[PDB]
Amino acid sequence: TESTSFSFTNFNPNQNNLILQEDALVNSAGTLELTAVAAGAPVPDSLGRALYAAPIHIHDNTTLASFTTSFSFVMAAPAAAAVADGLAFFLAPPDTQPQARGGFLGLFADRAHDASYQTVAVEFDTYSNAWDPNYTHIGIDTNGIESKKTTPFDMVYGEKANIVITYQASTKALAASLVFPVSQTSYAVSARVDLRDILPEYVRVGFSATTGLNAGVVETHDIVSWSFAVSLA
Amino acid sequence: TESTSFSFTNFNPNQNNLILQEDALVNSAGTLELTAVAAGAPVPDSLGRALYAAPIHIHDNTTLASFTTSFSFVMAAPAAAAVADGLAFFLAPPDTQPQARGGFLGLFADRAHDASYQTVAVEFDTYSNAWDPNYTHIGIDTNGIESKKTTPFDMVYGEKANIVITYQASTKALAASLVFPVSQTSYAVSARVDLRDILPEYVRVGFSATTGLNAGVVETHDIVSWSFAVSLA
Amino acid sequence: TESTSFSFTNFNPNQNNLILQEDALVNSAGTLELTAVAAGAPVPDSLGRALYAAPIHIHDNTTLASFTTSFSFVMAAPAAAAVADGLAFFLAPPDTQPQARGGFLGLFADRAHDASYQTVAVEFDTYSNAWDPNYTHIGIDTNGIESKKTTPFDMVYGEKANIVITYQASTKALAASLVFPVSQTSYAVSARVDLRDILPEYVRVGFSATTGLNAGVVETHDIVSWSFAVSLA
Amino acid sequence: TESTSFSFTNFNPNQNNLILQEDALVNSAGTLELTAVAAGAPVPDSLGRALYAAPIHIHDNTTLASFTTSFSFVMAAPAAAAVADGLAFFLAPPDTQPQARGGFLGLFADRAHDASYQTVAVEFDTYSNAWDPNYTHIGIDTNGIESKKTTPFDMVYGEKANIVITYQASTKALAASLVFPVSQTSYAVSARVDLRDILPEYVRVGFSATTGLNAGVVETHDIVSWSFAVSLA
Ligand SMILES: *[C@@H]1O[C@H](CO)[C@@H](O[C@@H]2O[C@H](CO)[C@@H](O)[C@H](O)[C@H]2NC(C)=O)[C@H](O[C@@H]2O[C@@H](C)[C@@H](O)[C@@H](O)[C@@H]2O)[C@H]1NC(C)=O
Ligand SMILES: *[C@@H]1O[C@H](CO)[C@@H](O[C@@H]2O[C@H](CO)[C@@H](O)[C@H](O)[C@H]2NC(C)=O)[C@H](O[C@@H]2O[C@@H](C)[C@@H](O)[C@@H](O)[C@@H]2O)[C@H]1NC(C)=O
Ligand SMILES: *[C@@H]1O[C@H](CO)[C@@H](O[C@@H]2O[C@H](CO)[C@@H](O)[C@H](O)[C@H]2NC(C)=O)[C@H](O[C@@H]2O[C@@H](C)[C@@H](O)[C@@H](O)[C@@H]2O)[C@H]1NC(C)=O
Ligand SMILES: *[C@@H]1O[C@H](CO)[C@@H](O[C@@H]2O[C@H](CO)[C@@H](O)[C@H](O)[C@H]2NC(C)=O)[C@H](O[C@@H]2O[C@@H](C)[C@@H](O)[C@@H](O)[C@@H]2O)[C@H]1NC(C)=O
Ligand SMILES: [Ca+2]
Ligand SMILES: [Ca+2]
Ligand SMILES: [Ca+2]
Ligand SMILES: [Ca+2]
Numbered sequence: 063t064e065s066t067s068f069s070f071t072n073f074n075p076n077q078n079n080l081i082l083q084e085d086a087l088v089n090s091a092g093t094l095e096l097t098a099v100a101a102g103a104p105v106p107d108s109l110g111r112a113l114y115a116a117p118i119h120i121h122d123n124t125t126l127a128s129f130t131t132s133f134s135f136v137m138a139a140p141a142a143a144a145v146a147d148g149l150a151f152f153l154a155p156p157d158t159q160p161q162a163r164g165g166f167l168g169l170f171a172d173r174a175h176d177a178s179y180q181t182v183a184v185e186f187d188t189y190s191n192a193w194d195p196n197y198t199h200i201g202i203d204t205n206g207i208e209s210k211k212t213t214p215f216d217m218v219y220g221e222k223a224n225i226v227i228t229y230q231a232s233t234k235a236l237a238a239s240l241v242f243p244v245s246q247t248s249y250a251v252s253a254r255v256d257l258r259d260i261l262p263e264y265v266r267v268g269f270s271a272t273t274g275l276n277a278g279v280v281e282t283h284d285i286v287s288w289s290f291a292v293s294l295a
Numbered sequence: 296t297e298s299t300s301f302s303f304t305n306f307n308p309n310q311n312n313l314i315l316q317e318d319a320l321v322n323s324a325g326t327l328e329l330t331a332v333a334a335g336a337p338v339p340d341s342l343g344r345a346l347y348a349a350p351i352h353i354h355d356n357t358t359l360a361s362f363t364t365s366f367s368f369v370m371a372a373p374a375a376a377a378v379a380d381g382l383a384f385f386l387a388p389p390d391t392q393p394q395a396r397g398g399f400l401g402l403f404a405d406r407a408h409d410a411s412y413q414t415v416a417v418e419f420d421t422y423s424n425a426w427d428p429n430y431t432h433i434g435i436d437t438n439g440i441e442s443k444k445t446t447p448f449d450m451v452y453g454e455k456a457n458i459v460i461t462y463q464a465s466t467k468a469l470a471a472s473l474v475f476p477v478s479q480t481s482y483a484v485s486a487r488v489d490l491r492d493i494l495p496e497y498v499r500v501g502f503s504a505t506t507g508l509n510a511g512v513v514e515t516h517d518i519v520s521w522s523f524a525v526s527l528a
Numbered sequence: 529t530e531s532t533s534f535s536f537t538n539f540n541p542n543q544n545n546l547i548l549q550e551d552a553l554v555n556s557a558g559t560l561e562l563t564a565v566a567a568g569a570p571v572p573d574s575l576g577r578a579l580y581a582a583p584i585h586i587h588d589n590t591t592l593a594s595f596t597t598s599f600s601f602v603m604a605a606p607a608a609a610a611v612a613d614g615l616a617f618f619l620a621p622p623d624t625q626p627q628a629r630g631g632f633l634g635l636f637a638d639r640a641h642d643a644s645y646q647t648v649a650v651e652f653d654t655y656s657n658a659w660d661p662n663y664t665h666i667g668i669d670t671n672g673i674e675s676k677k678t679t680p681f682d683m684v685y686g687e688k689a690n691i692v693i694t695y696q697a698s699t700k701a702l703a704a705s706l707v708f709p710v711s712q713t714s715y716a717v718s719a720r721v722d723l724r725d726i727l728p729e730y731v732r733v734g735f736s737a738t739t740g741l742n743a744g745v746v747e748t749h750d751i752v753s754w755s756f757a758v759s760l761a
Numbered sequence: 762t763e764s765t766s767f768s769f770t771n772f773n774p775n776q777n778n779l780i781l782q783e784d785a786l787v788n789s790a791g792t793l794e795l796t797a798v799a800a801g802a803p804v805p806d807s808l809g810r811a812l813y814a815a816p817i818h819i820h821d822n823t824t825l826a827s828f829t830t831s832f833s834f835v836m837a838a839p840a841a842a843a844v845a846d847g848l849a850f851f852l853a854p855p856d857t858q859p860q861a862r863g864g865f866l867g868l869f870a871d872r873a874h875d876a877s878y879q880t881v882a883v884e885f886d887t888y889s890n891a892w893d894p895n896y897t898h899i900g901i902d903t904n905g906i907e908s909k910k911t912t913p914f915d916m917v918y919g920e921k922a923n924i925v926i927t928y929q930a931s932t933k934a935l936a937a938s939l940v941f942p943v944s945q946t947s948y949a950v951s952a953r954v955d956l957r958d959i960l961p962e963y964v965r966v967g968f969s970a971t972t973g974l975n976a977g978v979v980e981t982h983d984i985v986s987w988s989f990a991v992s993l994a
């Protein structure tokens with residue numbers, strides 16, 4: 063048996079147990095800024111990822127782990143109608159490096175599906191690319207930017223969101239939920255996927271986010287709190 | 296700081312840490328049968344309730360507690376169309392006793408709202424009464440059977456369901472999600488409610504269920520697993 | 529599998545999830561006072577016990593649960609020279625009632641060993657009765673006041689002490705350690721005992737304590753904090 | 762607030778979440794052989810270390826964290842009176858590297874007390890060096906191999922032992938206890954140490970062990986299970 067848990071109520075500028083890539087960085091306020099913020103306004107062409115230092119044993123060939131994770135984020139926008147591109151929580155191999163920005167969220171290099179990405183991601187996509195449905199949406203990505211499944215949702219800017227993602231091993235279900243606590247709205251999605259055909263035994267977990275490739279088509283991507291727990295029986 | 300937590304992966308006929316009211320009972324297969332089962336058939340006119348033996352501290356007048364709970368259930372039915380009445384997870388005063396059966400779920404005596412009930416419930420409602428919407432639903436009940444908010448959902452008889460209910464003290468958000476892992480469908484609702492105004496400091500928690508009042512309009516109400524956690528920081 | 533856990537960093541005078549017996553009572557300052565305190569002084573002839581409300585599943589005939597519990601207490605004495613009688617942590621049948629005061633610590637009726645007590649206790653004994661070693665001591669009581677095993681220790685009055693008691697199921701070992709963190713001294717005992725032969729499947733756990741029967745041979749018995757976890761795999 | 766926890770009931774040869782140094786390796790049976798084992802006998806001159814991948818946040822300059830760790834080990838020896846050199850659990854800067862073998866257990870280079878070590882350790886010492894007492898002992902190393910405090914203890918080769926180390930912030934108490942369950946003997950030690958003055962904000966945790974520098978003066982140093990939890994309020 064094996065277990066890994068961790069939780070953050072706020073981050074520090076010198077979070078030695080977090081791996082920060084590209085522009086990610088932590089405020090002097092304790093908030094984790096995935097994408098760059100200059101004046102107090104989002105910048106375009108930005109990419110940032112944050113990973114937890116230790117790999118988690120997510121399966122051992124014959125048995126799968128269960129896991130639960132909760133986080134809360136905030137997106138601000140100078141113009142709530144021209145925004146991009148989104149954030150994602152993901153799982154991938156321990157040696158994962160940033161990919162292409164803009165629409166690819168730093169998780170892929172192009173629009174093809176490729177078994178070698180070995181990446182599973184849950185995305186909150188705010189810019190309709192050619193591979194997207196024409197509305198803001200949540201999507202489950204198995205090895206590609208073109209989701210396995212998506213559902214519509216309405217972003218509320220300036221409002222702290224609460225996310226919960228769970229994977230039950232006995233049914234091999236991965237479920238995600240999103241609630242806007244003050245606005246009182248919630249959205250949920252579920253798919254089955256056997257992690258043993260997709261991932262290596264050990265992965266790293268974390269966040270990724272990008273801003274649009276043009277001026278004014280832009281938004282913040284802040285992580286506010288984060289907790290995670292796994293169990294391998 | 297105060298916390299409570301418990302989990303059951305299955306039950307035992309002599310579960311002295313549960314309080315079983317009316318018909319509720321535990322199987323030879325270790326499954327909590329809230330309502331009565333004759334051969335392998337649900338009997339009508341049944342009422343069951345099961346509570347945790349320890350009262351829990353859900354608020355101290357000025358501060359609210361956070362809590363999360365997970366349970367799984369199964370409803371079975373000889374006839375998928377003649378069904379009633381549903382099951383519910385609830386919070387109430389420690390000395391709570393069963394109320395009326397049928398569409399009242401063993402939680403209320405009639406259909407009027409009344410602050411003296413001091414009860415909060417998330418209901419899984421399978422039969423439309425005069426006070427219901429005309430479709431299968433999940434509702435949040437605050438001191439009454441007439442829900443204060445509902446959303447539609449479609450049952451899947453014969454399939455284990457996963458439910459998660461979280462309460463976040465800082466935003467007073469009550470949120471529920473329900474997933475059919477095998478059929479891959481999920482539903483979510485959320486409301487804002489200040490428990491300090493509704494409940495006493497200490498409550499007991501658990502489930503209540505009822506079968507319909509007429510022969511042949513009936514379903515089982517089995518609880519398969521359950522876990523709970525509270526934090527009063 | 530079943531789990532049970534709770535923690536208290538401080539108490540409330542109306543702690544509905546504890547069972548207060550005889551003299552036990554909680555201060556306006558949140559300190560559990562097991563034996564009576566008049567103006568700042570402990571009273572003689574005092575007896576008091578406190579238990580967590582929910583029974584816990586400690587064995588099921590074939591398998592033992594493992595458990596861990598931590599608590600801190602303080603003893604205050606007008607004269608460190610004449611003190612009695614001590615405090616004990618114990619497991620017992622859910623319906624357990626207080627027995628004799630004084631040297632029996634509210635756990636037993638007289639000095640005989642009787643398998644029907646179904647009581648196991650770890651005691652901090654501050655007065656040498658005829659059935660005791662001549663020195664202050666920690667003791668392990670199996671169905672009787674006359675300890676099955678003891679080690680000597682010296683009480684430091686006025687200092688908050690830290691106690692940790694663990695039972696490991698696979699080796700059937702019961703272990704206790706005590707540390708006075710500021711004075712920097714520590715004590716420890718262990719012994720092997722199969723609970724399936726002694727206790728019923730379900731038990732309540734808690735503390736018990738008493739003062740001397742003669743004016744002036746007295747001390748306080750204050751529980752300041754408490755946490756517990758059990759796991760039955 | 763931040764937390765970190767993990768636990769291993771057994772290990773795997775490809776434990777990517779552990780950092781293995783020098784000779785450290787994992788058996789085909791799931792035991793972490795800190796020091797080399799050739800036929801079925803220990804090897805002289807061996808040095809092994811193992812750390813958890815993620816650094817842990819032990820303080821933020823003003824507030825200290827609390828922590829609890831539990832592990833089990835087994836030492837085997839061909840000849841009970843020709844054994845060396847012992848094993849240790851420790852905290853050190855994230856980029857800690859192995860030091861001198863033999864009686865330094867791989868934590869120190871010589872025998873001075875240099876504050877630039879930034880290392881705290883609890884050793885189980887099996888061979889008397891010049892700086893040691895003339896008996897097997899548990900010692901508390903703060904920035905040097907010459908323990909700041911020790912107590913005697915009698916080893917029991919072949920028997921699995923249980924160690925529990927707890928650090929408490931409010932009192933700045935470090936406390937160790939060791940139990941030989943089947944043999945029913947236990948030992949304990951405690952000391953007061955402010956980790957803000959010794960350790961950096963983030964440290965790694967783990968075990969180190971060495972065999973004797975001379976042919977035949979040897980013993981194995983195996984880790985069977987390990988559990989760890991921290992909280993920085
Ligand atoms: C553990 O041992 C107990 C003592 O034998 C069991 O209780 C006994 O169970 C018999 C059923 O096989 C029953 O006819 C006996 O009259 C009963 N005796 C007593 C002292 O209660 C206990 O069995 C469980 O508890 C009882 C009350 C029933 O609900 C049974 O269905 C249970 O098996 C044993 N517990 C377990 C978990 O097996
Ligand atoms: C939260 O509010 C309750 C009602 O406003 C408090 O109970 C009341 O406490 C009064 C003194 O504060 C007491 O004289 C009243 O009789 C009592 N009213 C009721 C409904 O019992 C409660 O105080 C706690 O509980 C009571 C029973 C006392 O034992 C107090 O010592 C307790 O503090 C309030 N709870 C807290 C933690 O403030
Ligand atoms: C999970 O399956 C893996 C691939 O089939 C195992 O790795 C393979 O193990 C072989 C030895 O049995 C070895 O020769 C192969 O080169 C290796 N393949 C790869 C891609 O590394 C893996 O076994 C674990 O990992 C290897 C590296 C060794 O350390 C084994 O001792 C480990 O058990 C399987 N993991 C488990 C938990 O069985
Ligand atoms: C704990 O104390 C450390 C020593 O004073 C702090 O590091 C120092 O912070 C200064 C910022 O006010 C900075 O100029 C110094 O260069 C730095 N010293 C070193 C040795 O790096 C530390 O502050 C954190 O660490 C530095 C790198 C910054 O990133 C700060 O923003 C961090 O807060 C103190 N840690 C905390 C939690 O304050
Ligand atoms: Ca897009
Ligand atoms: Ca209805
Ligand atoms: Ca005595
Ligand atoms: Ca030595």
Ligand SMILES: [Mn+2]
Nearest residue numbers: 187194201209
């Ligand atoms: Mn998309």
Ligand SMILES: [Mn+2]
Nearest residue numbers: 420427434442
């Ligand atoms: Mn309804």
Ligand SMILES: [Mn+2]
Nearest residue numbers: 653660667675
């Ligand atoms: Mn005694």
Ligand SMILES: [Mn+2]
Nearest residue numbers: 886893900908
């Ligand atoms: Mn030494």
